[model samples]
Target: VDCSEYPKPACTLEYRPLCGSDNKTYANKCNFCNAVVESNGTLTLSHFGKC
Candidate 1:
């Protein structure tokens, strides 16, 4: 896993929602990745769908 490649440059406009560890919603897993990067350790990987 390359840190440089983290926070992918682009992601599709898919509508699959995800819930962040602290109770946040995103449009896609890609959004989650970006959120994780921008928000740092606080974001965490989501479990899937609204939570």
Candidate 2:
């Protein structure tokens, strides 16, 4: 799942977790933001945890 936007704009280290619609987990909204963009806006947030 390599993309050109990964780590784009430089992400931060937060304890807040996020769960994607595809069951993927993110460290924070900053990272999730890029993940959604990298996935062409298909990936969505399911919850606020590593579901």
Candidate 3:
């Protein structure tokens, strides 16, 4: 999926930052999951803060 143009309504504005196994820091769980689906890769939460 092309997340670059993904709708924001599909996600919430919750500020719960998370570190993905991809070594990237997402704004929240919603963004992380979105990225995983967008990339079609297995990404797990590595921590609860920016990486």
Candidate 4:
């Protein structure tokens, strides 16, 4: 499951940015969580903001 394959419309219209332990800044929590899921526990959220 690729993160890019995650449906963008599934995310709500919010701006809660998230920073992944991989040093990546996701657009929002939805994208972050989806990425984590896609990563199969390889990725994690480092903080609740842009990296």
Candidate 5:
């Protein structure tokens, strides 16, 4: 979705495993952005999922 532009209001693609307990499809993209902003730019795109 080309979320590289927006910093605050991010985007995401919700998904579900259809068998997991959570059974909730969260916005992975937005979640990722949050991690980045929360880190105050300390976390890079490549290191986002590492945490």
Candidate 6:
């Protein structure tokens, strides 16, 4: 997934992966720290390390 999809400094009271479970995934122009469930039952994106 692209961290450039959402706005930066995005914080949420949601369940994040282990990699980013500490701090919200915030970027300059996007954020990837939001809680997200897998669609195809694949491994979580955070486990994939922002791939």
- List per-candidate RMSD values in Å: 2.9, 5.2, 5.5, 5.1, 8.3, 10.2
Q: Write the per-residue lDDT of candidate 4 for residues 1-51, one digit (tens) a residue.
A: 246455355778698778888998888867776777778868877877789
Error of 6 at 9 (Å): 1.9
Tens digit per residue, CA lDDT, model 6, 1-51: 553333334455443324343343423112332333222222234442332
Q: Model 4 scores what on Cα lDDT? A: 0.75
Candidate 5, 1-51: lDDT as tens digits = 234644766354564112211233323656645555565655434322222
**TM-score of structure candidate 1:** 0.72
Question: Which ranking of candidates, highest TM-score first?
Answer: 2, 1, 4, 3, 5, 6
lDDT of 3 by residue, 1-51 (tens): 234454355777888888888898899867887777767657677889899
Question: Candidate 3 vs candidate 6: which has greater TM-score?
Answer: 3
lDDT of 1 at 35: 75
Clashing pairs in 2: none
Return the TM-score for each candidate structure.
0.72, 0.75, 0.69, 0.71, 0.39, 0.25
Q: Is candidate 3 or candidate 5 better by TM-score?
A: 3
What is the C-alpha local distance difference test score of each model? Answer: 0.73, 0.79, 0.74, 0.75, 0.43, 0.34
lDDT of 3: 0.74
Ranking by lDDT: 2, 4, 3, 1, 5, 6
- What's the distance in Å from true for residue 1, model 6? 1.9
Clash totals, every prediction? 0, 0, 0, 0, 0, 1
Error of 3 at 6 (Å): 12
Window of ten residues with lowest summed lDDT in model 5: 16-25
TM-score of 6: 0.25
